[PDB]
Amino acid sequence: ALEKEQALKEKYVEMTYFENEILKEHPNAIICGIDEVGRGPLAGPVVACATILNSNHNYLGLVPVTKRLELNEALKNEVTAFAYGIATAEEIDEFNIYKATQIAMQRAIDGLSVQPTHLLIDAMTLDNALPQVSLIKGDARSVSIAAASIMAKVFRDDYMTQLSKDYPEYGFEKNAGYGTKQHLLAIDDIGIMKEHRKSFEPIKSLLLEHHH
């Protein structure tokens, strides 16, 4: 029992590498992790979360659904700060999904009770004037980022679940907006709605042929 437990602790410390390097140079640092979900679906918002972990954070296990829900509630109960940033399907169509994701991440920063001094970000740079580290597979490299992605995930899934109540035909509660055959057949049947991303294929090409 002291082994498997050691492994989780050891993993957790490796995943604090980047916060610890910053802290070494700045013990003052207010370190905020940022991740997003929802870049891939055909429908729904893109949802970013920004989180500053409490200094004595020890969310070991930072991923199946029971575990995700547990950590989601633990983080919400003990973290120094967290806030969600949303960019709508319309903004995604206007700005493209990359840029809409940047808007979502900054919106997440603005909603924080505490302004961060440093950002750890999953595969993204933000124009804002802050020091930041963009990390590939950030959610596996940083506890702050992993927390953010978990919280973003639960939020977006809850959102799409709420959506499926008002729009049952598209199958949102099951597909979370991905363009499955069911989702695409619903579109063929009753058309798109305000959560659909017009800039995303296969909708993009379907709108063309319709206008032609």
Resolution, Å (one decimal): 2.2
Whole-angstrom distance, CA of residue 122 vs CA of residue 3: 30
Instruction: Supply the DSSP symbol for 196.
Output: B
Angle, nearest 10°, between helix axes 143-166 and 65-78?
110
Tell me, what amino acid is at 127? D
Tell me, what amino acid is at 46? V
| Strand ranges in the chain using DSSP code E only, listed in sequence order | 31-37, 46-52, 81-87, 118-122, 132-135
Residue 123 has, within 13 A of its CA and on its CB side, a CA count of 12
| Residue 122 among known ligand-binding residues | yes
Listed in sequence order, the DSSP H helices in 41-142 are 65-78, 89-95, 97-110, 138-141
Whole-angstrom distance, CA of residue 105 vs CA of residue 103: 6
> Which tokens hold the place of 90?
């319309």
Residue 135 has, within 13 A of its CA and on its CB side, a CA count of 22
| Residue 157 among known ligand-binding residues | no
Tell me how crowded residue 161 is: count the other CB atoms within 10 A of its CB: 13
Parallel, antiparallel or unpaired: strands 118-122 and 132-135: parallel
| Residue 35 among known ligand-binding residues | yes
Fold for 1-212, please state it.
Nucleotidyltransferase; domain 5 (3.30.420)
Whole-angstrom distance, CA of residue 84 vs CA of residue 57: 20
- Widest CA span in the chain: 67
Measured between alpha carbons, how far is residue 35 from residues 47, 48, 136, 140, 165 in Å?
9, 6, 11, 11, 27
Structure-determination approach? X-ray
Which of 210, 203, 208, 201 is CA-nearest to residue 186?
203
Angle at 111 between CA 108 and CA 115, to 5 degrees: 95
In the chain, domain spans: 1-212
